[PDB]
Structure 1
Amino acid sequence: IKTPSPSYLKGTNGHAILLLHSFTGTNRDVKHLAAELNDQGFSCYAPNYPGHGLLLKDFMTYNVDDWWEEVEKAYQFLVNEGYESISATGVSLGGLMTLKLAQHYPLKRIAVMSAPKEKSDDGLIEHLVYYSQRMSNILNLDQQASSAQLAAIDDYEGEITKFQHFIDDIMTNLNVIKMPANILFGGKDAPSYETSAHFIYEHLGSVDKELNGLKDSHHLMTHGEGRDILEENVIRFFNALT
């Protein structure tokens, strides 16, 4: 049980793309999309947020400051490798990280999948419970081990509040994002993600921006139904760099 190492695909076209994963996910959320972009010539870097991949109690000793710091380090890695063209994409939390990156750095373009404009305490807790349940079954943890992981959720309340403020701060400042942008959501995701996507699209400062609601995509747009259409759309968007 460990947090995965980052995934760096070297390409040939001189353009680099950061790919950022979901809350409680890992970079396996973006593996296929990264590889497909690299097959088109891009360099791709998919970091893993600290804490992710660990059992729930350990996971909850990291927070949004740690996850953002890793994103900053990933961007700096690409700068230090010599890339002059750096772009970003991500799903859910990774979409939020992409927007925050765009507020900090001269990204060439961004593609944001399934970003929320707010999250409730109950919604975040439910995601932690699902993560803990899935981890325990994969690891075949016994009754007592699995039960203790869920016991620790109450002490994460302050970090949930921090996560909510992190979202709010990004959403308040979308007007500062001005590079070309592609905002995507899935028609088989909850309605709130369509509402969120419209809000994000409308508040971006970018002159060149598009909104794509893909009817057969689910929340994790990179996986499952609709994936070929999602990838075609995202790859076409980044191919405008070439």
Structure 2
Amino acid sequence: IKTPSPSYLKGTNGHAILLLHSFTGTNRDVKHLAAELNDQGFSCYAPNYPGHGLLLKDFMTYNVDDWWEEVEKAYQFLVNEGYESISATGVSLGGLMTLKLAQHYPLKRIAVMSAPKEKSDDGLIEHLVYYSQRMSNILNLDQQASSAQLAAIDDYEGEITKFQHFIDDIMTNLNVIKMPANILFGGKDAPSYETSAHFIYEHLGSVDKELNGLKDSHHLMTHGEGRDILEENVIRFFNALT
């Protein structure tokens, strides 16, 4: 069991795209979309947030500051590789990281999928519970371990609060984001994500922005039903760079 390594696809057209995964996901969330973008000429880089891929008790020794530092590091990696054109896309937490990147750096364009405008403590705890169960049926861990993993959740309360403030600080300052933006949500996701997408769209500073609700897409828009429609949309959006 280890955190996956980053994935770097070198392309030919001189433009680079960061691809950022979901909360409790890994960079396998974005593998297919990265591959399809690379087949259109783009260089693609998909980091993995620290702690992601590990058992819950190890996962919770990392926090949103660690995850953001890794995203900063991934941006700098592309700068150091010589790319003058860098763009970003991400799903769920990765969509939040994309928005934050755009507040800090001169990204060329951004595509944001399934970003929330706020998260409750129950909602985030519920993500962590599902993560630990999926992992126990994979790793076929005994019953005793599973329960201890979930009992450590109580000590993460301060880090949940930090994550909530992280979201609030991004959402307060959407007006400083000015480059072209594609805001996407799934019509088979919770209705709060449609409300979030409208909020984000309406508060962005960008003059060149679009809102795309995809009726067949679920929360993890890169996977499952509707994925072909999502990919065509995102690829069309980034191909405007060429």
Query: Which residue in the other structure is 1:13 paired with?
Result: 13
State how far apart, in whole Å, the 1-side matches of 2:160 and 2:147 are.
Answer: 21
State how far apart, in whole Å, the 2-side matches of 1:154 and 1:25 are.
Answer: 21
Partner-residue secondary structure (3-state), 1:4: coil
State how far apart, in whole Å, the 2-side matches of 1:60 and 1:207 are.
Answer: 39
State how far apart, in whole Å, the 2-side matches of 1:199 and 1:215 are.
Answer: 19
- Give 5+ residue unaligned stretches, structure 2: none
Deviations 1:153-210, CA, capped at 9 Å, x for gaps: 0000000000000000000000000000000000000000000000000000001000
Q: Quote how far apart the aligned CAs of 1:145 are.
A: 1.2
State how far apart, in whole Å, the 2-side matches of 1:236 and 1:156 are.
Answer: 40
Q: Quote how far apart the aligned CAs of 1:57 are.
A: 0.3
Aligned length: 242
Q: Quote how far apart the aligned CAs of 1:2 are.
A: 0.6
Query: Which residue in the other structure is 1:95 paired with?
Result: 95
Deviations 1:24-69, CA, capped at 9 Å, x for gaps: 0000000000000000000000000000000000000000000000
Partner-residue secondary structure (3-state), 1:79: helix
Deviations 1:206-228, CA, capped at 9 Å, x for gaps: 01000000000000000000000
Partner-residue secondary structure (3-state), 1:112: strand
Deviations 1:79-117, CA, capped at 9 Å, x for gaps: 000000000000000000000000000000000000000
- Give 5+ residue unaligned stretches, structure 1: none
Deviations 1:100-145, CA, capped at 9 Å, x for gaps: 0000000000000000000000000000000000011100000111
State how far apart, in whole Å, the 1-side matches of 2:136 and 2:187 are.
Answer: 31
Residue identity (%): 100
Partner-residue secondary structure (3-state), 1:185: strand
State how far apart, in whole Å, the 2-side matches of 1:63 and 1:213 are.
Answer: 31
State how far apart, in whole Å, the 1-side matches of 2:154 and 2:145 are.
Answer: 17
Partner-residue secondary structure (3-state), 1:89: strand
Q: Quote how far apart the aligned CAs of 1:147 are.
A: 1.3
Query: Which residue in the other structure is 1:37 paired with?
Result: 37
State how far apart, in whole Å, the 1-side matches of 2:32 and 2:162 are.
Answer: 31
Query: Which 4+ stretches in 1 moved above 6 angstroms?
Result: none
State how far apart, in whole Å, the 1-side matches of 2:182 and 2:210 are.
Answer: 5
State how far apart, in whole Å, the 2-side matches of 1:147 and 1:161 are.
Answer: 23
State how far apart, in whole Å, the 1-side matches of 2:145 and 2:130 are.
Answer: 16
State how far apart, in whole Å, the 1-side matches of 2:135 and 2:24 are.
Answer: 10
Q: Quote how far apart the aligned CAs of 1:146 are.
A: 1.2
State how far apart, in whole Å, the 1-side matches of 2:36 and 2:147 are.
Answer: 40
State how far apart, in whole Å, the 1-side matches of 2:143 and 2:172 are.
Answer: 44
Partner-residue secondary structure (3-state), 1:179: coil
Q: Quote how far apart the aligned CAs of 1:17 are.
A: 0.1
Partner-residue secondary structure (3-state), 2:36: helix
State how far apart, in whole Å, the 1-side matches of 2:60 and 2:151 are.
Answer: 12
State how far apart, in whole Å, the 1-side matches of 2:173 and 2:228 are.
Answer: 32
State how far apart, in whole Å, the 2-side matches of 1:69 and 1:136 are.
Answer: 28
State how far apart, in whole Å, the 1-side matches of 2:205 and 2:128 are.
Answer: 33
State how far apart, in whole Å, the 2-side matches of 1:180 and 1:237 are.
Answer: 9
State how far apart, in whole Å, the 2-side matches of 1:6 and 1:178 are.
Answer: 29
